[PDB]
Design a protein around this ligand. Structure first.
Ligand SMILES: O=C(CO)[C@@H](O)[C@H](O)[C@H](O)CO
Ligand SMILES: O=C(CO)[C@@H](O)[C@H](O)[C@H](O)CO
Ligand SMILES: O=C(CO)[C@@H](O)[C@H](O)[C@H](O)CO
Ligand SMILES: O=C(CO)[C@@H](O)[C@H](O)[C@H](O)CO
Ligand SMILES: [Mg+2]
Ligand SMILES: [Mg+2]
Ligand SMILES: [Mg+2]
Ligand SMILES: [Mg+2]
Lengths: 284, 283, 283, 283
């Protein structure tokens, strides 16, 4: 997996036949290599229809999800493996090439205490199996580190790396997010450096989830590190500019993050491509 | 209120006699003008003792708090006024010059939905009451904007300004925190600019709550904005480096933020002093 | 003088009838309020043609220059006044609203020593006279600070401010350049802050003279300072992307700065506009 | 060659016995691994004295120079070889491990035109010979890229790398200077990345030659690039804080860059070591 991606949430988080068409068509208009398709309600994902759309528009896909609470691997690793293998099945059915995201827990997950080794044992057992399952379907398995307010288990790149190395699977990659790194990394570039070889996927997100290039992310340090480590993965725009007000509680977002999704698609994708070119990402 | 401050959490969770002494003596050791004293357990505070120690060490103080959930102003405005007024009495007894912090809500407060005008009405009525009570005590009353994950009500500087103007009191100031602004402000300096009529207090906090100078906060933009708006208030260091693991849940902090309070105090207070001089913050 | 500007150099430094319409039409195409028109050879400048173009395409203009060595005001103030007054005449004829740039010396000017009071007396004498001539023509007069390698007299905003203060004229403004400030200012925002009473004109130039947004200028600090001091002048794009190689020696530019002028105009003017929106420079 | 260095110019660029003593003892008091010793007047350099002082204080050293104009390699390559080999002889006698700096030209060197192939042929011939001499002494040979106003031949890391690879010697390294990169590199970290193979030496220098951490150099991008390419060389502080007013013409510096060398040494070296440790530069 290599190139420029855009998260389907730039159009919506729904994945009915209409939303799938709008996001895939739109990602094609903006000349993206990948679309990241969220898996929210697995039973309602028509993998035949989606693959038909991806093939029609010449688009590559990765899937992502957050584990629902009944499936949080911290506490319920067996339900984690079920939900993750079910999502992996939809992913491979669609022609997607990876499942990534918060594949190990929730984005509102909290015990009140620091992570315990019992919890990490649950995470590694659960992800041991689902990654093995992904292996049988030709898929790569992603682990996205998120900030301390969303999850208490994987916040820094070093924690994500440590987890990947304990699982010991050869098809798990670290997935970083500049919005989360802006809080978690002691100097955002240190996150990319720590993940180095396991880093194959980036959410390129402004500090306020608005428009990359118009916030507090130090994009020169981010692109410098990506170039210097020889990054050859996927740079996916993630912004909440198209998020409807009903999504607020699920993304902890209480006011508009930008003017509108079209301006974010225009200015943000251009910014990522222009900065990628300035730093010769993918320039072998 | 003007000058350099340090939050007492660099030494102490609580505020018993020996914690109060260690924090105040420590702040005095680092030449600070202000110590910020958190008020958590109001009956356990010995304000007369604190006042004597502040005077012995030549320190000025501001008090701060987060409202406990029974007193969140958005839903229980009358409980909020009762708690804030009790807090202000204790602050006044100590000789503090202001009560600030999350004086309108919690840091684990969430409704699931964006803030409603009914909630803002409750906030406006409650803070107007307690700012008034602060005014009778000779105290200023601060509103600290925090990030979206701690609270749904006052996140950006513009929201803080909007609330301060709705309240309409002359002793209320806006209090910004660079750790929160690093997420909430569309360019961190925009928060300082937005608050320029009311900004009197800063938490100078690195993006990971570690050491200022060694994270992702754009300090040149922060200090430039402070200088250009003519900032005359307090620059208070806030870091979680002394926080014990027992507090992890209260601050949503799951791993060390730095190597130790001693080097955050050494390096971070020096960094803030050195940047203030570079930008001529106090002349 | 308010708004978004582009230096005519994005098309050509020559100002014949061909080059003039090409530049003014191009500036109009990009929705610019101002074009900055260089005055290298005053006899070659046909002001009647230029003002006609400016009016048709709805463009306003500032003129700029660098003093030729026979006219360097530090040594030959009388020759400076004569040269400056002739440029001001041509500027007024073509309907420009200001003469700015290195109006006080050269861009290869150096003495080997720090600037003396006698040189600044020469500067002040010359600029006082020509600024007054400018005032009678209804023109403002600008002083652009440049880096230590181009000139030894006016490098920092503080220096430009002090010179403007000494002259004591109402129509002289400070003109700053982000390319030069990136070297000269101890934190680029400190130059904008220092010039707050006199700053009416910016050259928004990347650190390598390339494309704003794609270099080392700290644009957040620049725009934050601009907004915070309530800047109301012109933001003019300066880039060497269209300079022919025969200009190399005159601008000490030995290799390409970007991938052609069309890309710089597209990306760079948009970037200046977007950042201005982000920091509400003009609203 | 690895560790932290300080340029002897922080105390003097004269190298009489007392100046050498003051400089080497000074670098020792600030815990440096290296001191960078400028070679200007060769006959007044007592090498035995210097070597003894280096070993006494446990200091390692690199030498550096700028070619005098009669020996600029681009036009007078035979004279460049003669000068470089003599400087190499003195460096090895002193116990220094390398000769670096502007080893290929001047800092006021300028043809009026972009650099030519013939000029680079002269550079290749001269530097390949003198690097071959350096190898017989067991020294490495450095090429420092400087900005467009000091030299027209080696400005960007890219240019330096192309010249190093053309020569083909295994003891030539690229030497970068953040002061010069802040102008020459399209994103300062791009210069470090382009030099990755050959980068063994840095001048860590603020944008105004003042105090690192208090200017416009994007230190997080610099240290990120250095960490990510696995840099294992020397981080040498360079600042003009201690420069006497009589040096102004030689370094094109017309006003103080800082308040004093003692503050620059204290704050700047501490900034470099703190960032180095933040980005885990060494081990
Ligand atoms: O940043 C996040 C969540 O904090 C997103 O990457 C999320 O994991 C994705 O939307 C899953 O589909
Ligand atoms: O940043 C914070 C919490 O988000 C602190 O300012 C807090 O409000 C204060 O510590 C209360 O005592
Ligand atoms: O920055 C510069 C030169 O250093 C330009 O602003 C120059 O002064 C102008 O082009 C003269 O007309
Ligand atoms: O940056 C520079 C030159 O501009 C220094 O590296 C210089 O070469 C030094 O004085 C050599 O001794
Ligand atoms: Mg993400
Ligand atoms: Mg705070
Ligand atoms: Mg200019
Ligand atoms: Mg140097």
């Amino acid at each position: 997996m290599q190139g420029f991606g855009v998260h389907a949430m730039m159009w919506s988080l729904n994945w009915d036949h209409e939303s799938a068409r709008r996001a895939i068509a739109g990602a094609a208009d903006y000349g993206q290599d990948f679309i990241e398709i969220p898996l929210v309600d697995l039973p309602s994902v028509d993998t035949a229809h989606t693959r038909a759309l991806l093939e029609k528009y010449g688009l590559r896909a990765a899937c992502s999800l957050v584990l629902p609470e009944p499936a949080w691997a911290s506490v319920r690793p067996e339900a984690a493996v079920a939900h993750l293998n079910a999502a992996l099945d939809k992913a491979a059915e669609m022609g997607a090439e990876a499942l990534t995201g918060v594949t190990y827990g929730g984005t509102s997950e909290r015990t009140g205490f620091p992570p315990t080794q019992a919890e990490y044992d649950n995470l590694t057992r659960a992800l041991s199996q689902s990654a093995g399952h992904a292996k049988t379907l030709g898929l790569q398995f992603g682990i996205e580190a998120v900030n301390r307010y969303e999850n208490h288990l994987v916040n820094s790149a070093e924690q994500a790396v440590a987890l990947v190395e304990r699982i010991g699977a050869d098809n798990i990659f670290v997935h970083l997010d500049t919005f989360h790194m802006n809080m978690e990394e002691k100097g955002i570039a240190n996150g990319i450096i720590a993940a180095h070889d396991y880093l194959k996927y980036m959410h390129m997100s402004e500090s306020d989830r608005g428009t990359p290039g118009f916030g507090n992310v130090a994009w020169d340090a981010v692109f410098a590190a990506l170039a210097a480590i020889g990054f050859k993965g996927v740079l996916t725009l993630e912004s909440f500019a198209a998020m409807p007000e009903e999504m607020a509680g699920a993304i902890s977002t209480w006011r508009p993050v930008a003017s509108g999704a079209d301006e974010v698609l225009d200015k943000g994708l251009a910014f990522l491509r222009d900065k990628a070119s300035q730093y010769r990402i993918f320039g072998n």
